[PDB]
Design a protein around this ligand. Sequence first.
Ligand code: K
Ligand code: K
Ligand code: TL
Ligand code: TL
Ligand code: TL
Ligand code: TL
Ligand code: TL
Ligand code: TL
Ligand code: TL
Ligand code: TL
Ligand code: TL
Ligand code: TL
Ligand code: TL
Ligand code: TL
Lengths: 94, 94, 94, 94
Amino acid sequence: KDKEFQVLFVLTILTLISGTIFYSTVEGLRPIDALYFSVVTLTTVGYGDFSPQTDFGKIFTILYIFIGIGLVFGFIHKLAVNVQLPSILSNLVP
Amino acid sequence: KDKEFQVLFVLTILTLISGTIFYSTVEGLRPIDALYFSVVTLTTVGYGDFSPQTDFGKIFTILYIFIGIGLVFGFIHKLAVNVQLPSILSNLVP
Amino acid sequence: KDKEFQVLFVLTILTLISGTIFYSTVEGLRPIDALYFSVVTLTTVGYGDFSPQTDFGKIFTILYIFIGIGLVFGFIHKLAVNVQLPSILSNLVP
Amino acid sequence: KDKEFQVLFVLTILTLISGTIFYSTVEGLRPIDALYFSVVTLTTVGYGDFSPQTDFGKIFTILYIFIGIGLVFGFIHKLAVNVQLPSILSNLVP
Ligand SMILES: [K+]
Ligand SMILES: [K+]
Ligand SMILES: [Tl+]
Ligand SMILES: [Tl+]
Ligand SMILES: [Tl+]
Ligand SMILES: [Tl+]
Ligand SMILES: [Tl+]
Ligand SMILES: [Tl+]
Ligand SMILES: [Tl+]
Ligand SMILES: [Tl+]
Ligand SMILES: [Tl+]
Ligand SMILES: [Tl+]
Ligand SMILES: [Tl+]
Ligand SMILES: [Tl+]
């Protein structure tokens, strides 16, 4: 639980590393924009201020979403259950 | 349940207060636009009519999403289960 | 189950009726655009091809999302479980 | 489980085939853009770089979302549980 959250954290980090490199290189975004876009994509926000322009970028984004969404939201949840909720409940009492 | 919903309500309010101040100040949005954007972000709608323009805004938005999504949707759900569904079911019968 | 799906269906319909009237009137959208926008909003797609321009539209959209998201996705799910999955499984065998 | 994932995979594929043909034809998108848009829609990302322009496209998109969202996310999850998580856990040990 405290130990499992560390697994999803690495996996998420690795997923975002992959998107940051792909979109910097193929779509030509600055690395910070590429990471931002990767996060905005896999959390399903999708502002569209960055969006792939090339057919290679679109095909990767299809695959990137299907693979990553399940992971990322897995991490958000465990962060919610096993890391966020404790601190909350511990602040309720002295 | 009636008591827990009040916890998530405050926490959500505090999360949206934080986004409203950050985006008003760093991204220069009117306070109402900043709150609207914060809500549109953390519910994962993401119209993109407002989107951060500065690197500081993008880095904060990455962190803001990961922290807040789990909270907000937690509140939507409890609102659904413990506050919305009762009124519905009570209207079914006299 | 077959009976409960009918409840969420009406409630969803009523939620979308409300958005269709509000956005037609306050934001000035054609009624079909207003319904489309209401659906695109409460399912959290959020293309942003329509987005509220007035402060009244933004305040309503904040409230509309928090109230409706929980409902709508409730209906999508029951449609998935109690109406979509049966037909699927019945087609598996003669 | 290994067998059920194959069911959702076909159904998802068929759902995306339908969107690819509809949006190519009615909205006039290149087939690759149409598939990309279908995926970006049903995963609720919604960049809005493509969005339907015709009333027929908007009405279909309303129905397409309500029908498909439940399916697609069903597939993402099973992919997460029954296909993604194993490989993860098997890499943990030799
Ligand atoms: K946009
Ligand atoms: K735009
Ligand atoms: Tl945008
Ligand atoms: Tl941009
Ligand atoms: Tl979304
Ligand atoms: Tl979006
Ligand atoms: Tl937009
Ligand atoms: Tl704006
Ligand atoms: Tl958008
Ligand atoms: Tl747009
Ligand atoms: Tl428009
Ligand atoms: Tl979205
Ligand atoms: Tl866009
Ligand atoms: Tl386009």
